[PDB]
Design an enzyme around this catalytic site. Structure first.
Site, PDB file in Angstrom:
ATOM      1  CG  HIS B 238       0.240  11.248   0.540  1.00 18.17           C
ATOM      2  ND1 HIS B 238       0.265  11.822   1.845  1.00 18.17           N
ATOM      3  CD2 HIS B 238       0.598  10.068   0.595  1.00 18.17           C
ATOM      4  CE1 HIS B 238       0.418  10.878   2.450  1.00 18.17           C
ATOM      5  NE2 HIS B 238       0.894   9.642   1.863  1.00 18.17           N
ATOM      6  CG  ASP B 242       4.570   9.349   2.036  1.00 15.60           C
ATOM      7  OD1 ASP B 242       3.797  10.114   2.730  1.00 15.60           O
ATOM      8  OD2 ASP B 242       3.900   8.478   1.590  1.00 15.60           O
ATOM      9  CG  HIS B 265       7.424   4.844   2.064  1.00 18.13           C
ATOM     10  ND1 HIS B 265       7.420   6.142   2.914  1.00 18.13           N
ATOM     11  CD2 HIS B 265       6.404   4.718   1.390  1.00 18.13           C
ATOM     12  CE1 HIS B 265       6.249   6.449   2.460  1.00 18.13           C
ATOM     13  NE2 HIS B 265       5.623   5.762   1.799  1.00 18.13           N
TER      14      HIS B 265
HETATM   15  C1  LIG Z   1     -12.349   0.073   2.501  1.00 20.59           C
HETATM   16  C2  LIG Z   1     -11.074   1.059   2.462  1.00 20.59           C
HETATM   17  C3  LIG Z   1     -10.319   1.347   3.666  1.00 20.59           C
HETATM   18  C4  LIG Z   1      -9.290   2.227   3.671  1.00 20.59           C
HETATM   19  C5  LIG Z   1      -8.091   1.869   2.814  1.00 20.59           C
HETATM   20  C6  LIG Z   1      -7.492   3.043   2.167  1.00 20.59           C
HETATM   21  C7  LIG Z   1      -5.933   3.224   2.138  1.00 20.59           C
HETATM   22  C8  LIG Z   1      -5.724   3.362   3.793  1.00 20.59           C
HETATM   23  C9  LIG Z   1      -4.603   2.140   4.405  1.00 20.59           C
HETATM   24  C10 LIG Z   1      -3.373   2.518   3.930  1.00 20.59           C
HETATM   25  C11 LIG Z   1      -2.716   2.083   2.626  1.00 20.59           C
HETATM   26  C12 LIG Z   1      -1.353   2.888   2.574  1.00 20.59           C
HETATM   27  O1  LIG Z   1      -0.621   1.929   2.337  1.00 20.59           O
HETATM   28  C13 LIG Z   1      -1.380   3.977   1.390  1.00 20.59           C
HETATM   29  C14 LIG Z   1      -1.010   2.814   0.001  1.00 20.59           C
HETATM   30  O2  LIG Z   1      -1.695   1.981  -0.175  1.00 20.59           O
HETATM   31  O3  LIG Z   1      -0.256   3.545  -0.938  1.00 20.59           O
HETATM   32  C15 LIG Z   1       1.124   2.944  -1.412  1.00 20.59           C
HETATM   33  C16 LIG Z   1       2.128   3.942  -1.485  1.00 20.59           C
HETATM   34  N1  LIG Z   1       2.693   4.574  -0.185  1.00 20.59           N
HETATM   35  C17 LIG Z   1       2.967   3.312  -2.586  1.00 20.59           C
HETATM   36  O4  LIG Z   1       3.760   2.326  -1.833  1.00 20.59           O
HETATM   37  P1  LIG Z   1       5.280   1.777  -2.015  1.00 20.59           P
HETATM   38  O5  LIG Z   1       6.194   2.838  -2.184  1.00 20.59           O
HETATM   39  O6  LIG Z   1       5.475   0.593  -1.009  1.00 20.59           O
HETATM   40  O7  LIG Z   1       5.000   0.932  -3.349  1.00 20.59           O
HETATM   41  P2  LIG Z   1       4.418  -0.373  -3.713  1.00 20.59           P
HETATM   42  O8  LIG Z   1       5.543  -1.224  -4.220  1.00 20.59           O
HETATM   43  O9  LIG Z   1       3.518  -0.898  -2.629  1.00 20.59           O
HETATM   44  O10 LIG Z   1       3.429   0.033  -4.975  1.00 20.59           O
HETATM   45  C18 LIG Z   1       3.036  -1.024  -6.119  1.00 20.59           C
HETATM   46  C19 LIG Z   1       3.479  -0.357  -7.428  1.00 20.59           C
HETATM   47  O11 LIG Z   1       3.051   1.203  -7.500  1.00 20.59           O
HETATM   48  C20 LIG Z   1       3.821   1.674  -8.415  1.00 20.59           C
HETATM   49  N2  LIG Z   1       4.581   2.794  -7.789  1.00 20.59           N
HETATM   50  C21 LIG Z   1       5.093   2.652  -6.355  1.00 20.59           C
HETATM   51  C22 LIG Z   1       5.612   3.612  -5.795  1.00 20.59           C
HETATM   52  C23 LIG Z   1       5.463   4.830  -6.129  1.00 20.59           C
HETATM   53  O12 LIG Z   1       5.998   5.975  -5.769  1.00 20.59           O
HETATM   54  N3  LIG Z   1       4.990   4.920  -7.507  1.00 20.59           N
HETATM   55  C24 LIG Z   1       4.636   4.121  -8.351  1.00 20.59           C
HETATM   56  O13 LIG Z   1       4.158   4.121  -9.333  1.00 20.59           O
HETATM   57  C25 LIG Z   1       5.022   0.691  -8.780  1.00 20.59           C
HETATM   58  O14 LIG Z   1       4.746   0.144 -10.331  1.00 20.59           O
HETATM   59  C26 LIG Z   1       4.934  -0.426  -7.916  1.00 20.59           C
HETATM   60  O15 LIG Z   1       5.390  -1.665  -8.292  1.00 20.59           O
HETATM   61  O16 LIG Z   1       2.554   2.717  -3.678  1.00 20.59           O
HETATM   62  C27 LIG Z   1       1.130   2.583  -3.824  1.00 20.59           C
HETATM   63  C28 LIG Z   1       0.416   3.771  -4.169  1.00 20.59           C
HETATM   64  O17 LIG Z   1      -0.678   4.272  -3.257  1.00 20.59           O
HETATM   65  C29 LIG Z   1       0.578   1.936  -2.439  1.00 20.59           C
HETATM   66  O18 LIG Z   1       1.261   0.703  -2.337  1.00 20.59           O
HETATM   67 ZN   LIG Z   2       2.683   8.853   3.210  1.00 21.96          ZN
END
Ligand SMILES: CCCCCCCCCCC[C@@H](O)CC(=O)O[C@@H]1[C@@H](N)[C@@H](OP(=O)(O)OP(=O)(O)OC[C@H]2O[C@@H](n3ccc(=O)[nH]c3=O)[C@H](O)[C@@H]2O)O[C@H](CO)[C@H]1O
Ligand SMILES: [Zn+2]
Ligand SMILES: CCCCCCCCCCC[C@@H](O)CC(=O)O[C@@H]1[C@@H](N)[C@@H](OP(=O)(O)OP(=O)(O)OC[C@H]2O[C@@H](n3ccc(=O)[nH]c3=O)[C@H](O)[C@@H]2O)O[C@H](CO)[C@H]1O
Ligand SMILES: [Zn+2]
Ligand SMILES: [Zn+2]
Ligand SMILES: [Zn+2]
Lengths: 327, 301, 323, 302
Positions: B238, B242, B265
């Site tokens: 996934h 993305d 992203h």
């Molecule tokens: C009760 C239950 C109800 C339902 C809840 C389930 C979910 C449904 C809701 C939507 C949630 C979505 O949002 C999906 C979601 O949460 O997944 C996002 C995802 N896209 C990506 O997000 P993003 O690219 O912005 O990275 P961050 O900075 O935020 O990540 C922080 C730290 O991660 C490391 N990192 C970051 C990026 C990367 O490529 N690799 C890597 O290692 C790095 O160390 C960084 O400092 O990273 C994370 C990985 O799942 C999440 O944040």
């Molecule tokens: Zn996605």
């Protein structure tokens, strides 16, 4: 599979495809079977139900509604189809149709879905309150209360709207009903009941209600509020007896924190002060870290009262956590 | 040469936005040749259009979200873009009456279903690819993305989530991009989030529409979804989905080798903007990518 | 393809639990004469997985033993054989399989080889065969120098024999091997420093361990010795310092206990007594060792985690919960 | 006349005991007519034959376990007994070289597979059936079991675990026993067990060989197995599997209606002993149940 026969084999294959996530193939199989001209009415209804579940599991919600509205009038699948439609209307944030379907289901016999009706009405009233229209919010709250009279959310929302309108006496009248409607959620009204009584100025009755709440095992919030008012009423050291007594029956981290603070306020200094500092810096360092509310169906823990628990999507399940961990 | 593709029928779908929770009536409509994918908001009395340009992406907290100068947003366009890139759609008008492309089941499979049900036409016009010429790399600390010259589109994503539920699965996936390969391998991996930070994100105005039905919810130590992981290493798959969606924001299928490590992203869009900013790093070409023709092979007992 | 139509229905049937049908399908496919060599090997692997899922280990072993000579499947077959030999309490062969896997590249199996040798020693221990137990533990140490179980087992064996100098020498290696598990040695170590007769070195080592954030057990032992040495006042001072630097519920209970001894009689003292009655119960009820891969919390150290069945992933819980 | 049954070949299978964790080598062997299921410990001096009889059961902690006078034991005979009852085996010799029947996958599906692979031969003699003339019942507080007269073999089980992960599933099951019905509806239900009570059970000496591959490890709020439940309500199905296994301890298939609420191994064995004690409450009969006929299925080649 494809070696289990026909029709039913198609249904099992489609179910497997949906479970594995290959949504397109699941819809293709189910729709091919449904369009078959050799199906019986029962098999066609089964196919339509499976197709509707396929659409719902694929996220295409209006197609799911289209494939589920054809099963409500059928006696065999009425309840299941109405349940799935209720789920769709909950997820897609259309509260009015969800209320209509819930009323259909409750008329059908399932009386457990009255709390959900009250919650849908409360959500509609919240939507209206967001636009500063208290009359319509009150009307919807009244309708929800008429639907179900054992919902704490309806009472809390009624208190909120009354406080917005300034009818503080009615706000207290509605809020205090939560004591009999649901004990575990009493702590949610104190923050606003205090304001209501302050505006009314009935301090003695406020203290009386706090005493009743603590005697009724409402939570640590009531005990802390009562101790705070007592400290000003009749001094701190002389009136420290009440906090000590309430402590013994229902000890909780949030309570002994106040006792440690009282000891710190009047202490003999020296090593004892250093101790009673390093502690009272630790009990208070896990009074705010620990979660305060827990869902008693799936274990979800949160710092705020989620009426609609995100994990299991069950209404009126998250309640304060009691016992050496919080309220 | 590879021919531009659009849809044959306007196709609707009513879902719930993941990051807003609203009910969005997405509508994909055909466009004539040489128009590019254009997003659009319909609830606004004057219809507002976002041409697909990397500069449009301005908010990327958790989802590539277009924003024009007046703060009109269409968030979560990173999965529909993934499906369009997989099927190689070059001209299509996407309309949403609420400020978010729906999420469907979290993955990009429902969008592939919608597009295939619409039917993909082949206009009698050349298809413009954006082929790289010089290596361009951008880093955000430990995270780093890199585009290299290559005769095709090949992804080499990587992930390093320090989490026991994601570390037991292959933290690396590489594939030679192609319509059938995308539809088979990557087009079902679901968006994955952590149940630890859902109380917080929902307080910040994000993940409001999320639930078990549209995401993989990994708790502190294991994946909570009743079904389980669709693949064995769905997380990296996934993440690459993305990546494809974000890279499609340039408006055309890219040709090259995209190797990334912990790329979010924001990093992908930064890489795309950097690549497009260098006039000597990319050029418009035609008929240089692998086949984008879906194969109707499945026909077992 | 026609063949791939099988091995996907069979996998489905095995997943659904109908092993009677998955095994039947895979066996019928294998018996067919139209299978190519690679397809036959794939069928053999699927049948072996079917048997292993159904729990017929003597047949899963037989099936997987046909793949150890095929280059493509060697890793998978050897890993499955290792799982089978771990499950059916047969270590003398699990060690052979793990050593073959090591020779074939996987260098993370040295931990499991050391643990198999330790388990064999444990089998020979408790039957008063300590010489062979020590021999096996020495072999395990040779197969891996970064295993805490080997050091602790060697310490136990030395203590049973009576050589306490070597016991302490081996036990002290846990700090260099794995710091997180140092709390395991302390108890045993204490004895080998008492009857040996080196109390000053015991206190010095406890101080060093505490300064190295060894854990709550080391802090409590250091506090107790400081008490017995220089009165209760110095002990309370030191415990307060460590609590401020490192907060732990166990140290909190120790501080409460020391406070009780120094407190004027009053209802406040009774409130502290009830606070102890609650906090001691809570600390005695909280788990001590937790796994770092599956969130399994056990009240005693498990080397082989029951849930994820991964070796040396259960470590003491660190923070405000326990140690 | 239904006719007695047995195996055709000596069929073996190794496994890991659930409650001891020791490698075991189950060896099912044929026997002549009128022998009854006799379990046998083979690692002992001579052997230790345990003629299947409700009185032999003397330890029912978490596994109906045979114990003779000398404390030689064969534990966890519930699932193998359930499989034999499902296939209606009346003459078979079960040998284990370690003190417990293996666990396989925590259900009776592996044992059904082994028995079918051996082949169910039919002997030339009538099959003894225990027909329940008079209703009998036993209770253990809030748990109870009841045998009622019937022209067949029907089961009706109910459970109540007041657990958030089991209450959501169906809590009542009922069927008319038959070889195909058992093979299709109950032979696959796993050995559901809780994760919270594993440290304690392993400390006490039980569940030393249980793992995620041979049980439904249900944590405080949900099933922890990756695959999930084979049936949406397989907890009650497995409980009825254990009930069938316990009731088969009498050595012959029973004819009656067995209705149980929160029944365990101890309660089932107590009910069986109570029924077998009242000479007028049970009798020997023949030709009362429609067993056998394990219909095959298509084998396409594609
Ligand atoms: C009760 C239950 C109800 C339902 C809840 C389930 C979910 C449904 C809701 C939507 C949630 C979505 O949002 C999906 C979601 O949460 O997944 C996002 C995802 N896209 C990506 O997000 P993003 O690219 O912005 O990275 P961050 O900075 O935020 O990540 C922080 C730290 O991660 C490391 N990192 C970051 C990026 C990367 O490529 N690799 C890597 O290692 C790095 O160390 C960084 O400092 O990273 C994370 C990985 O799942 C999440 O944040
Ligand atoms: Zn996605
Ligand atoms: C970390 C990695 C883990 C790896 C794998 C671990 C699991 C391995 C598989 C074996 C696990 C065993 O642990 C067996 C296991 O869990 O299942 C037994 C199960 N048969 C039954 O108990 P059972 O009949 O044997 O015997 P009791 O005398 O104890 O029953 C009377 C007591 O049970 C209550 N009761 C009983 C029956 C009922 O219908 N309702 C109900 O409430 C009753 O209220 C009273 O408290 O009840 C429990 C329900 O799982 C368990 O004890
Ligand atoms: Zn919940
Ligand atoms: Zn573990
Ligand atoms: Zn059982």
């Amino acid at each position: 599979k494809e070696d289990t026969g026909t029709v039913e084999a198609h249904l099992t294959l489609g179910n497997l495809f949906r479970s594995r996530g290959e949504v397109d193939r699941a819809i293709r199989i189910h729709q091919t079977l449904m369009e078959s001209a050799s199906l019986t009415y029962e098999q066609r209804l089964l196919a339509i139900q499976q197709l509707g579940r396929d659409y719902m599991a694929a996220g295409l919600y209006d197609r799911a509604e289209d494939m589920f509205n054809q099963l409500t009038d059928e006696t065999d699948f009425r309840i299941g189809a109405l349940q799935q439609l209720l789920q769709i209307y909950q997820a897609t944030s259309e509260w009015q149709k969800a209320i209509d379907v819930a009323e259909r289901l409750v008329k059908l016999g399932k009386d457990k879905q009255r709390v959900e009706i009250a919650h849908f009405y409360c959500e509609l009233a919240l939507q209206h309150m967001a636009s500063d229209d208290l009359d319509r919010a009150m009307t919807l709250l009244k309708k929800g209360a008429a639907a179900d009279k054992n919902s704490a959310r309806v009472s809390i929302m009624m208190g909120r709207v009354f406080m917005a309108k300034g009818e503080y006496a009615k706000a207290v009248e509605s809020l205090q009903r939560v004591i009999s409607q649901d004990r575990e959620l009493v702590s949610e009204t104190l923050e606003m009941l205090q304001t209501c009584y302050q505006q009314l100025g009935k301090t003695a009755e406020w203290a009386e209600f706090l005493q009743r709440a603590v005697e009724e095992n409402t939570g640590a919030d009531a005990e802390l509020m009562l101790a705070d008012i007592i400290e000003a009423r009749d001094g701190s050291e002389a009136a420290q007896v009440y906090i000590t007594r309430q402590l013994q029956r229902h000890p909780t981290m949030r309570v002994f924190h106040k006792l440690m603070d009282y000891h710190l306020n009047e202490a003999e200094e020296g090593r004892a002060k250093e101790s009673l500092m390093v502690l009272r810096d630790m009990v208070g360092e896990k009074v705010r870290s620990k979660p305060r509310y827990r869902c008693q169906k799936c274990g979800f823990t949160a710092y705020t009262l989620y009426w609609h628990c995100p994990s299991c999507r069950a209404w009126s399940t998250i309640k304060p956590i009691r016992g050496l961990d919080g309220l | 040469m590879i021919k531009q593709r659009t849809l044959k029928r306007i196709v609707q779908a009513t879902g719930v936005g993941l990051h807003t929770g609203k009910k969005v009536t997405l509508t994909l409509r055909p466009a004539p040749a040489n128009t590019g994918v254009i997003y659009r908001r319909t609830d606004l009395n004057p219809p507002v259009d976002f041409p697909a340009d990397a500069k449009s992406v301005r908010d990327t907290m958790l989802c590539t979200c277009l924003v024009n100068e007046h703060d009109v947003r269409i968030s979560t366009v990173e999965h529909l873009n993934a499906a369009l890139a997989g099927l190689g759609i070059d001209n299509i008008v996407i309309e949403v009456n609420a400020p978010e492309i729906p999420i469907m089941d979290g993955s990009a499979a429902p969008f592939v279903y919608l597009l295939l049900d619409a039917g993909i036409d082949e206009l009698n016009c050349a298809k413009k690819f954006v082929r790289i010429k010089e290596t361009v790399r951008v880093e955000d600390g430990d995270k780093w993305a890199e585009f290299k010259p290559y005769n095709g589109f090949s992804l080499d994503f990587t992930i390093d989530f320090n989490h026991p539920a994601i570390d037991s699965s292959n933290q690396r996936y590489a594939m030679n991009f192609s319509a059938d390969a995308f539809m088979r391998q990557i087009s079902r991996a679901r968006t994955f989030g952590f149940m630890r930070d859902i109380e917080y994100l929902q307080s910040r105005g994000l993940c409001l529409g999320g639930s078990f039905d549209c995401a993989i919810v990994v708790d502190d130590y294991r994946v909570l979804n009743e079904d389980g992981l669709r693949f064995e290493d769905e997380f990296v798959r996934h993440k690459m989905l993305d990546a494809i969606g974000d890279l499609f924001m340039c408006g055309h299928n890219i040709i090259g080798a995209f190797t990334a490590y912990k790329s979010g992203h924001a990093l992908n869009n930064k890489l795309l903007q950097a690549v497009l900013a260098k006039q000597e790093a990319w050029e418009y070409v035609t008929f240089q990518d692998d086949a984008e023709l879906p194969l109707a092979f499945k026909a077992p007992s």
